[PDB]
C-alpha cells in the first residue's frame, strides 16, 4: 500500500488504543476532564473577584478565566501527553509500521479533540448563564489558537525526543508546567504587574498568545506594549524545526 495509507491506519489504531487508556475502563475520565476547569474557576471566584473588579470592571471573571484557562490547559495537556509517549507504547514498536512519531501524533489528535469539546461545552454553558460568550474576532482567535497548538505540539515532541536518555529530567518538566500557570496571566490580568517585571515576562510566548487570544475574544481589550504575534510565531517555528530535525537525528535510537 501507499505509505500515507499505512500511516493513516497506524494513527487510527493508535488513537483507538490511546482513547481507552486516557479516558478509562468505565470512561470515568469524562467525569474529571469536564470537571477539570470548573474546579479551578470556582475557587478563584472566592479569591480575587473583587480584586479583579477593582483592576478591570469592563469584563468579568467567569469569562476572563475561561478565555485563558482551557487554552492553557490544552497546551499543558499536549505537552504532558506527548512527553509521556514512546515509552507507554514501547512494547508496540514491534510491527515495523508503528514509528515513535505516530504515538505523539495520535496523542496530539486525542488531546486536541478532547480540549475542543471542552471549549465548546464551556462556551455553551457560559452562554446558558447569560454571560458574554460569543467571540468578537473569531478568525484571529482561531489563528492564535493554531499558533499555540503548533508551539505546544513542538515542545511536546522536543521534550519526548530529548528525554529518552534521561527520564528523570522529564519529571521536572512537568513541575515546570506549574509556574507557567502562575506567570502566563491566566488567573489574574497582567496589567497589574509592576513595569520593571514585565520585560522579563515578555520572553514567554504563552503569555503573548494568551493576551492575543483574550484581545481577539473580548470587545475593547487592550494589549500591552511589546506583546505581538511575530515573536511567538517565530519561537514556535524554530522550536518545531529543531524538534523535527532532532527526531530525524535520533530516529533509530528511540525504536
Amino acid at each position: 500500500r501507499s505509505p500515507w495509507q499505512i500511516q493513516q491506519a497506524v494513527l487510527f489504531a493508535l488513537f483507538l488504543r490511546e482513547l481507552k487508556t486516557r479516558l478509562g475502563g468505565r470512561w470515568l475520565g469524562v467525569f474529571w476532564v469536564l470537571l477539570e476547569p470548573v474546579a479551578h474557576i470556582a475557587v478563584m471566584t472566592t479569591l480575587f473577584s473583587l480584586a479583579h473588579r477593582a483592576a478591570m470592571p469592563s469584563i468579568e471573571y467567569p469569562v476572563f478565566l475561561i478565555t485563558g484557562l482551557i487554552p492553557f490547559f490544552m497546551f499543558r495537556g499536549l505537552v504532558t501527553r506527548l512527553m509521556e509517549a514512546i515509552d507507554s507504547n514501547r512494547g508496540l514498536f514491534a510491527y515495523r509500521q508503528v514509528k515513535p512519531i505516530d504515538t505523539v501524533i495520535a496523542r496530539a489528535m486525542l488531546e486536541i479533540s478532547l480540549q475542543s469539546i471542552v471549549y465548546l461545552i464551556a462556551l455553551g454553558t457560559l452562554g446558558w448563564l447569560g454571560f458574554h460568550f460569543l467571540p468578537v474576532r473569531a478568525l484571529e482567535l482561531a489563528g492564535v489558537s493554531a499558533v499555540l497548538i503548533m508551539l505546544g505540539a513542538s515542545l511536546g515532541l522536543f521534550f519526548a525526543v530529548v528525554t529518552n536518555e534521561i527520564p528523570q529530567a522529564r519529571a521536572i518538566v512537568r513541575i515546570s508546567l506549574l509556574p507557567l500557570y502562575f506567570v502566563s496571566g491566566v488567573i489574574f490580568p497582567v496589567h497589574t504587574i509592576p513595569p520593571q517585571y514585565l520585560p522579563l515576562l515578555q520572553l514567554n510566548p504563552v503569555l503573548h498568545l494568551i493576551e492575543l487570544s483574550r484581545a481577539s475574544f473580548f470587545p475593547q481589550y487592550r494589549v500591552l506594549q511589546g506583546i505581538n504575534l511575530a515573536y511567538p510565531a517565530g519561537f514556535a517555528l524554530l522550536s518545531l524545526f529543531l524538534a523535527l530535525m532532532l527526531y530525524r537525528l535520533r530516529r533509530h535510537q528511540l525504536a
Binding site: 478591570m56 470592571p57 469592563s58 470587545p219 475593547q220 487592550r222
Partner: protein, 49 residues
C-alpha cells in the same frame, strides 16, 4: 424619533428587524442590542456606537 417605525423598515431579512406588535421588554432588549456603550477605564472615556 420613532425608533419603532425605523427599525421595522427592512422586510428583506427577518433576523435583525423589529417585528410589529412586539413586547416592551423585547423592544428594550433590541434597543440595548443596537446601541453599544463601552467605557475605557484608564482614561474613563465613554464611547457610544
Amino acid at each position: 424619533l420613532k425608533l419603532r417605525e425605523h427599525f421595522g423598515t427592512p422586510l428583506r431579512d427577518p433576523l435583525f428587524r423589529l417585528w410589529g406588535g412586539t413586547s416592551q421588554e423585547w423592544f428594550l432588549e433590541y434597543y440595548r442590542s443596537r446601541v453599544e456603550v463601552l467605557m475605557d477605564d484608564i482614561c474613563g472615556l465613554l464611547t457610544v456606537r
